[PDB]
Design a binder for this molecule. Structure first.
Ligand SMILES: C/C=C(\C)CC/C=C(\C)CC/C=C(\C)CCC=C(C)C
Ligand SMILES: [Ca+2]
Ligand SMILES: [Zn+2]
Lengths: 313, 325
């Protein structure tokens, strides 16, 4: 386990957990698939949501009761189950078992309130914008409810502007954009709008590694050089000068130095050869842990340059 | 920015004899965390045994006792559970097979049944469910092919469909998540690159892109996180390094800085490693600390396979050593 910093109540909690665990397993071997089971496991799963076998037991119980109960009784059971799940997620929102049981449950209902599930997501994501279990569940809900790529794109925009911790929202955007495109990597107009959105982010918070990672992808997602349009060429030159400005304001910022090299590659490898090499030396001094990566990147670019010069007529 | 700062009285030497003592004694002292982690016991046994073997101390654990325990954890469907009375799962099936492989005792279980179990969990899109309740995760794609590779039975699953699912999980940043659309995370990257090694598909990985993402996991403290903006954790010295090693980019990490971080995570009094300096120790982080140091070239520790997290001498014995990048 993690985040555990360096007794009597612990010994009493354990003996209760042991007795209830004891009791559930006996009841299970005996084939007693009933609400008492549900009562027993609720006491354990609350503190201990990664005890997977007890989620299976709840499922076995609910499955059995669906046969030998009325529809209204079965409906009351699923609503109780949804409340229980929500209270488990409040105490531990990062358990595989809980989120899976919620999906299992929702997938077998006929008809689930999917808009309510999307709102649950928005709440958990206000609390922790990086919780990947909750983004996965959101993608599950959006698919089941056939929510359109454009609606989800609108959700991601609010999340990126309202605050940072944006790696998961930029990741989401990278999947959504290709979809409303679609294609059988990004059309120029879409790309240009995204470059503008990402460049806002990284001049708003140059710390903010997620926008730089996304921006590197955008730089490779074009139709490339030199089919550089005059608009894209201008945009990239203007990004280059803005990164140079930011370099003055933040001379220890490694992301803007790397991005300058990348932009020069995107613009004209051979024309900017001298400046590119200068930037590698500044970068290595600023981010010495990445020296090996940076030497290997520079070697790759120098080889590409040699190939470009050998292509001369 | 989020990082630990290592204190200057942090251990700076490898305390091998203490770590063997910690593991050899573990689960002997009604202990709370023991009791409470029964749901993963089989994997816990795998962590303890593997680390003892990397340290040359395997003989100090109880072979006879463990073989009987494993045998009693195999269910009629062929899958293995974490502990007696618990439900079978691909996670614990892999751990049991890894343990039996360490002990050269594979026919302690019914291998035909393990194979049929794994086969049964593959879905139409090539993904694997963890068990009968249908949770899909690239973690389970790796457990399936790793289990089958160790048994010589990789041909039993639909390999092309399996590869296609895993490649559908590859992201804008070169990494992999749990399912298609899922954000990259070092743990998942380990599972997916491990999978692509076993199935001979490492040429489909963008090694320079992924390698960059991985080496950017290293914080000024020298420790590695599992994704951007998170705290370092000694177990990422396994997930990230093993992935880097598989894709041929292990030298992209600052090795001395990471080594100093790993050693700082040791508890010099009790032995074992914690997730970060000053936290409580556990066998999970003890294995990944020691395995991480082995990958970095530590002479007191046996060479470890980056794919199977077992001593390489074991895998050489069963002739299962995937080519890496
Ligand atoms: C977080 C990644 C978890 C990975 C697994 C459960 C796969 C099994 C792990 C090993 C063989 C080290
Ligand atoms: Ca022994
Ligand atoms: Zn950890």
């Amino acid at each position: 386990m993690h985040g555990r910093l360096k007794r009597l109540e612990r010994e009493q909690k354990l003996k209760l957990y042991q007795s209830a665990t004891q009791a559930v397993f006996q009841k299970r071997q005996a084939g007693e698939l009933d609400e008492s089971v549900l009562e027993l496991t609720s006491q354990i799963l609350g503190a201990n949501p990664d005890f997977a076998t007890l989620w299976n037991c709840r499922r076995e119980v609910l499955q059995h009761l669906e046969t030998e109960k009325s529809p209204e009784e079965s409906a009351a059971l699923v609503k109780a189950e949804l409340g229980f799940l929500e209270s488990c997620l409040r105490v531990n929102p990062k358990s595989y078992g809980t989120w899976h049981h919620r999906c299992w449950l929702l997938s077998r209902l006929p008809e689930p309130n999917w808009a309510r599930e999307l709102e649950l997501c928005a709440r958990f994501l206000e609390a922790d914008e990086r919780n990947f279990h909750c983004w996965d569940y959101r993608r599950f809900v959006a698919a089941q409810a056939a929510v359109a790529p454009a609606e989800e794109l609108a959700f991601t925009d609010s999340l990126i502007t309202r605050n940072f911790s944006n790696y998961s929202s930029w990741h989401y955007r990278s999947c959504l954009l290709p979809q409303l495109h679609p294609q059988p990597r990004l059309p120029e107009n879409v790309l240009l709008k995204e470059l503008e959105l990402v460049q806002n982010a990284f001049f708003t918070d140059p710390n903010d590694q997620s926008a730089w990672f996304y921006h590197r992808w955008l730089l490779g997602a074009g139709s490339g050089r030199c089919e550089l349009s005059v608009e894209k060429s201008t945009v990239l030159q203007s990004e280059l000068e803005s990164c140079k400005e930011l370099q003055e304001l933040e001379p220890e910022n490694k992301w803007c130095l790397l991005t300058i090299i990348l932009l020069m590659r995107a613009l004209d490898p051979l024309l900017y050869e001298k400046e590119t090499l200068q930037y590698f030396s500044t970068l290595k001094a600023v981010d010495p842990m990445r020296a090996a990566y940076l030497d290997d990147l520079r070697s790759k670019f120098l080889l590409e340059n040699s190939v470009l010069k050998m292509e001369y007529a | 920015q989020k990082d630990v700062t290592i204190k200057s009285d942090a251990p700076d030497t490898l305390l091998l004899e203490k770590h063997a003592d910690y593991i050899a004694s573990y689960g002997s002292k009604d202990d709370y965390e023991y009791c409470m982690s029964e749901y993963l016991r089989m994997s816990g046994v795998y962590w303890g045994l593997t680390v003892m073997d990397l340290m040359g101390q395997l003989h100090r654990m109880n072979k006879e006792e463990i073989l009987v325990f494993i045998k009693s954890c195999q269910h009629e469907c062929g899958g293995v559970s974490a502990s007696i009375g618990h439900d079978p799962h691909l996670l614990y099936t892999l751990s049991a097979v890894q343990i039996l492989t360490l002990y050269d005792s594979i026919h302690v279980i019914n291998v035909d049944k393990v194979v049929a179990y794994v086969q049964s969990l593959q879905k139409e899109d090539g993904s694997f469910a963890g068990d009968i309740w249908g949770e899909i995760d690239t973690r389970f794609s790796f457990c399936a092919v790793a289990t089958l590779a160790l048994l010589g039975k990789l041909d039993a699953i639909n390999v092309e469909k399996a590869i296609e699912f895993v490649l559908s999980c590859m992201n804008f940043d070169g990494g992999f998540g749990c399912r298609p659309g899922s954000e990259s995370h070092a743990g998942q990257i380990y599972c997916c690159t491990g999978f692509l090694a076993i199935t001979s598909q490492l040429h489909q990985v963008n090694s320079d892109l992924l390698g960059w993402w991985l080496c950017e996991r290293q914080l000024p403290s020298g420790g590695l996180n599992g994704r951007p903006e998170k705290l370092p954790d000694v177990c990422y010295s396994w997930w990230v390094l093993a992935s880097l090693k598989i894709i041929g980019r292990l030298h992209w990490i600052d090795r001395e800085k990471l080594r100093s971080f790993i050693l700082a995570c040791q508890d010099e009094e009790t032995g074992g490693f914690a997730d970060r300096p000053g936290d409580m120790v556990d066998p999970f982080h003890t294995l990944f600390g020691i395995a991480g140091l082995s990958l970095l070239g530590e002479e007191q520790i046996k060479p470890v396979s980056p794919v199977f997290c077992m001593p390489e001498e074991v895998l050489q014995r069963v002739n299962v050593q995937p080519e890496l990048v």
